Write an enzyme that holds these catalytic residues in place. Structure first.
Site, PDB file in Angstrom:
ATOM      1  N   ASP B 291     -68.086 -12.760 -65.473  1.00  0.00           N
ATOM      2  CA  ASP B 291     -68.200 -12.328 -64.089  1.00  0.00           C
ATOM      3  C   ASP B 291     -68.079 -10.828 -63.967  1.00  0.00           C
ATOM      4  OD1 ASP B 291     -68.806 -14.666 -62.470  1.00  0.00           O
ATOM      5  OD2 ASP B 291     -66.912 -15.348 -63.268  1.00  0.00           O
ATOM      6  N   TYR B 375     -67.521 -19.892 -57.800  1.00  0.00           N
ATOM      7  CA  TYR B 375     -66.143 -19.531 -57.999  1.00  0.00           C
ATOM      8  C   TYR B 375     -65.691 -18.358 -57.142  1.00  0.00           C
ATOM      9  CZ  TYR B 375     -64.538 -22.850 -61.527  1.00  0.00           C
ATOM     10  OH  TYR B 375     -64.088 -23.973 -62.181  1.00  0.00           O
TER      11      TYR B 375
HETATM   12  N1  LIG Z   1     -70.187 -16.751 -61.713  1.00  0.00           N
HETATM   13  C1  LIG Z   1     -71.424 -16.303 -62.350  1.00  0.00           C
HETATM   14  C2  LIG Z   1     -72.290 -17.523 -62.565  1.00  0.00           C
HETATM   15  C3  LIG Z   1     -72.914 -18.080 -61.278  1.00  0.00           C
HETATM   16  C4  LIG Z   1     -73.710 -17.322 -60.443  1.00  0.00           C
HETATM   17  C5  LIG Z   1     -74.300 -17.891 -59.312  1.00  0.00           C
HETATM   18  C6  LIG Z   1     -74.085 -19.225 -59.027  1.00  0.00           C
HETATM   19  C7  LIG Z   1     -73.273 -19.961 -59.854  1.00  0.00           C
HETATM   20  C8  LIG Z   1     -72.684 -19.392 -60.972  1.00  0.00           C
HETATM   21 CU   LIG Z   2     -61.717 -23.654 -63.847  1.00  0.00          CU
END
Ligand SMILES: [NH3+]CCc1ccccc1
Ligand SMILES: [Cu+2]
Ligand SMILES: [NH3+]CCc1ccccc1
Ligand SMILES: [Cu+2]
Ligand code: NA
Ligand code: NA
Lengths: 621, 621
Positions: B291, B375
């Site tokens: 992230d 998240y």
């Molecule tokens: N957190 C980065 C990965 C992500 C990005 C967009 C939707 C779901 C997951």
């Molecule tokens: Cu988790």
């Protein structure tokens, strides 16, 4: 009808005193060393209350002590037995003995000679009343001994802990009122600096920079108290008990999930704590204080001052205990109860739905604080909106001191010039009589499982978990494994959630070190519980403490290592989890002259107990 | 004069845009993927400010990206270099690419065939824009790829996470706008139940039992903010920075001890985080989202609502970042700052002196919350009255879902009927550029030492500690040892407290599991930092992230394992501690449909830094 889990009342204690008196068990030579209500028997509650109290009775004239159970309801003695303390252990330290050690030593020639060599005025020498344990002194077997370590008070408001008198220890028989030994191994300078944390010379000018933080509840608290000690808060239900040995105990912890009141924990307490010292000097190498089992932490619970000890909208309980003669004694404002804001509970801002959602968490807090000599501890239980249960101990007070040797030490820290702090641990045992969705429970040890790159895992990313059921007590003495993420799950194998999986709660330990002493030491035998992180036993009403019932001067092996040997079935049965957790303390300069709080604890989180998050019905703030 | 640690202002960002434009580096085909101020150089501050900004520039027409540093003060380009992304890594994911994956797939025949087989309306199918990593697809080397996993929205306000489309994944080149692969391994039912946590059908009637908790400060807060971001609170001083990649960063953490401003930490940040997934299905076995390094967590910082996200007397910062074209963009109320009550600080009731003493603790909180897809994370830094420093991450949002296989899974949890949650970890790296009493620092690993009963320890009670200095980077890659109480002390070997011992701070880890993937996996090479708990490097201004500067689609080995190989002297030098800490998550039913917060973090406590407790001057409440 009255709840059998209600707190003891003053009149109940007086009735115990009366029953004992009428039965011939409480004449003028008797002293009550412990008295407490017993919990109702399993399956009771069928409109037949029987409130029983258990009492340990000491005799100041040399007769043997007794353990007695009375029925306060029926006015009867259920059982009374004389104790052979050389086998079963001595009774807990009496509050009246705290002064006796110094008093006896003040007229002993050997003690006076030691003080005179050091130019110490006997009137200024405090003597800590320290539990003796069991070592090489055969003359102590069957005798009620305390050991004494000296600390100088330069004036009556002085902190004596700044002025340990090292090289000197004495042993006293507190019944025959004789000094059995005075050991003087050599003079050490008595550290000179004071430790008076209210003296402006040491504090400096008090800061004026703190602006008030005001916590109020304009509509009052969200919990109710009924029946004196029954709490209802945010789906939780429980009863708050108080025992002179254990302090606050929690009964019948349950959670209302829709229309069902679902049990979680039948009884939660800190059933022992111990402070073993790691200094090999003979002046202290015997020192291990079991604040719970030897001293009784509830007896010393503080009265908690509003605004200082408990901030916000506080509801207090004032529990009643017995004095040494069987008269009731209230501990005013000894238990704090309040709810606290606890940050964000759940939050998500969703790009695709456009919904932004935030909810706040809160916790119910039930706490008390106790002081046993130099040390002070706060015991805190927390219930969270999401079903988590947590315990935290807050250790503060004044560290136990010694001289700091010339030329340093591998077992003692320096705090001030010439002033040392011996290394030690503070180790707790939480006794959790489990009732996950009722009494049919089992424990699994869960480890993370690493997987090898290869067929079925070609990218080498997979990982898994393994659960091992602890089927009998012979397999239920477990150690931590932080590296593998080890936890323990208590489940009900006969109660499944909507996904057809057994409901459970997961115990998350802090994985701090366990008892460091050599396994052949006296303390390793007397505090065997402290050598392992997790024990599981089959419930039995008389298996109350991990160290047994009479800890003081017991020679070893009592409690959990004896209980476990019964090898009872624990796979879908009424079981008790005993979790050891502690702080290992190499004291730092910052701990002197009064120690900033440090903490240790554990928590349990629901693990498939609910059918989905249990906090979807929490409203927006 | 202006502080070189001040937050970037809107005008500074516009000036960067102008400098780039005038230099020929920011025409209409260019997009800014990262832009941030750089920290002042060591020894600067001699009345010669030079505010530099670093920029990663993407080109939508296929030209190579550039890394550029400008001096906003001087209107100059310091450096500009084209990047060969097949070697150095691709630039961070662009916000504009979040929509592209779905858009490209919506007209691809293979994707439409997969959806039609499942009777899914393309207009309802969301596609998550997921980082690709580096696996076996040679055609991806040097190309900017995202991978797509599908989730159905039954209506525009529906939580798509309830409806994963398993058995299907696609890969897209987001520059050439081509779909490189569509993999359909088999149909799985799309889980039927919704996860709409604001729908009364699922929440039930909202509880009416919560009464308000009001936290106010009638005289305002005890901290001041000057120069936009310089905080003074209860002896602490620091500057609050904000970078689009790292989020909130703390500079110049120092403590005023009498008249001296004593440095502690020069820069504190979360320099990476990664979420590796442990499901060996080819639909997800490539999934590892960084992230911080791939997506940039500061970019997605939420606007924090008073009363909901931050309760009490809050002071906000509204940090400025760049949009994709170099225009300034404010994140309104993106950083919360406030002080909180924190229970008892120190307490002792002394029988011998008769003095009863209680003081309350408080903490300064600096936090932000970010959302990257499903998240959401809160990052919290805490400063306590007693000198302790703590970080806590709060993980919430919606768990990443899959189908739950027939017949169960060793790598996926069931959350609802047919709905799974693959196992994963959330692993953080805290980069702590240390300055304990200044820059000359060293690290020692401290273990508890058990001692054998025998001569010099006849009662078998002694225990001790051992400290091992980490002298060079070759010896400074360390693992946890919870069983032996392992911690790491950062000290200044040239600055002694009044007891003639080096001043220090002790790092207390949670000792959670580190990266579980096989050591031969791609993720173990790309997130090598995550395989060990503690790394120590010699400071170098360009060693900013434990994963290197260009994480996206880098093939492995960048960052700390490369830095450490320099084998620099770290024994009394300007050093940086990189602490890995994470949560291993086997999702529970209670995490669905929105996850209650769970936490992980670490703390540092003074260890002989002060000459006695630093809180003796705190007044009675
Ligand atoms: N957190 C980065 C990965 C992500 C990005 C967009 C939707 C779901 C997951
Ligand atoms: Cu988790
Ligand atoms: N905490 C139990 C040991 C103790 C008792 C009295 C003074 C000092 C120490
Ligand atoms: Cu301690
Ligand atoms: Na039980
Ligand atoms: Na440094």
């Amino acid at each position: 009808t009255a709840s059998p889990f209600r707190l003891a009342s003053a009149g109940e204690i007086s009735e115990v005193q009366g029953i004992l008196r009428t039965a011939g068990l409480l004449g003028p030579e008797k002293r009550i060393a412990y008295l407490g209500v017993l919990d109702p028997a399993r399956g009771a509650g069928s409109e037949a209350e029987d409130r029983r109290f258990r009492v340990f009775i000491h005799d100041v004239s040399g007769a043997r002590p007794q353990e007695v159970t009375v029925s306060v309801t029926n006015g009867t003695v259920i059982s009374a037995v004389e104790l052979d303390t050389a086998a079963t252990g001595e009774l807990p330290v009496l509050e009246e003995e705290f002064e006796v050690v110094e008093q006896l030593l003040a007229t002993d020639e050997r003690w006076l000679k030691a003080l005179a060599a050091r130019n110490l005025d006997v009137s200024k020498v405090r003597v800590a009343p320290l539990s003796a344990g069991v070592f090489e002194y055969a003359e102590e077997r069957g005798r009620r001994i305390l050991r004494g370590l000296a600390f100088v008070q330069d004036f009556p408001e002085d902190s004596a802990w700044a002025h340990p008198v090292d090289g000197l220890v004495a042993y006293v028989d507190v019944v025959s009122k004789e000094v059995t030994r005075v050991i003087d191994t050599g003079v050490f300078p008595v550290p000179a600096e004071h430790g008076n944390y209210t003296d402006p010379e040491l504090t400096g000018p008090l800061r004026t920079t703190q602006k008030p933080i005001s916590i109020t509840q304009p509509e009052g608290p969200s919990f109710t108290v009924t029946g004196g000690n029954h709490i209802e808060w945010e789906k939780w239900s429980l009863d708050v008990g108080f025992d002179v040995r254990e302090g606050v105990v929690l009964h019948n912890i349950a959670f209302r999930d829709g229309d069902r009141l679902r049990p979680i924990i039948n009884r939660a307490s800190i059933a022992e704590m111990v402070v073993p010292y790691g200094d090999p000097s003979p002046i202290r190498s015997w020192q291990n204080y079991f604040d719970t089992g030897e001293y009784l932490v509830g007896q010393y619970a503080n009265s908690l001052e509003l605004g200082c000890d408990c901030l916000g909208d506080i509801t207090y309980l004032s529990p009643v205990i017995s004095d040494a003669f069987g008269n009731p004694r209230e501990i005013r404002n000894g238990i704090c109860m309040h709810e606290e804001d606890w940050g964000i509970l759940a939050k998500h801002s969703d790009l695709w739905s456009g919904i932004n959602y935030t909810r706040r968490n809160r916790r119910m807090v039930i706490s008390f604080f106790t002081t046993i000599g130099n040390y002070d501890y706060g015991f805190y239980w927390y219930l969270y909106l999401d079903g988590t249960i947590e315990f935290e101990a807050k250790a503060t007070g004044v560290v136990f001191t010694s001289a700091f040797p010339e030329g340093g030490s591998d077992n003692i820290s320096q705090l001030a010039p010439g002033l040392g702090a011996p290394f030690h641990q503070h180790i707790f045992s939480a006794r959790l009589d489990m009732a996950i969705d009722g009494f049919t429970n089992r424990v699994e040890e869960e480890d993370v499982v690493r997987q090898t790159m290869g067929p079925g895992n070609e990218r080498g990313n997979a990982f898994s978990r393994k659960r091992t059921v602890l089927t009998r007590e012979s397999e239920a003495v477990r150690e931590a494994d932080a590296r593998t993420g080890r936890t323990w799950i208590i489940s009900n194998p006969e109660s499944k959630n909507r996904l057809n999986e057994p409901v459970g709660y997961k115990l998350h330990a802090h994985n701090q070190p366990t008892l460091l002493a050599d396994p052949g030491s006296s303390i390793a035998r007397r505090a065997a519980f402290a050598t392992k992180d997790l024990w599981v036993t089959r419930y039995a009403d008389d298996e109350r403490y991990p160290t047994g019932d009479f800890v003081n001067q017991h020679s070893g092996g009592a409690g959990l290592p004896s209980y476990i040997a019964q090898d009872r079935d624990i796979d879908g049965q009424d079981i008790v989890v005993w979790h050891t957790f502690g702080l290992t303390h190499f004291p730092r300069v910052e701990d002197w002259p009064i120690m900033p709080v440090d903490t240790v604890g554990f928590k349990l989180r629901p693990e498939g107990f609910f059918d989905r998050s249990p906090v979807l019905d929490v409203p927006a703030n």
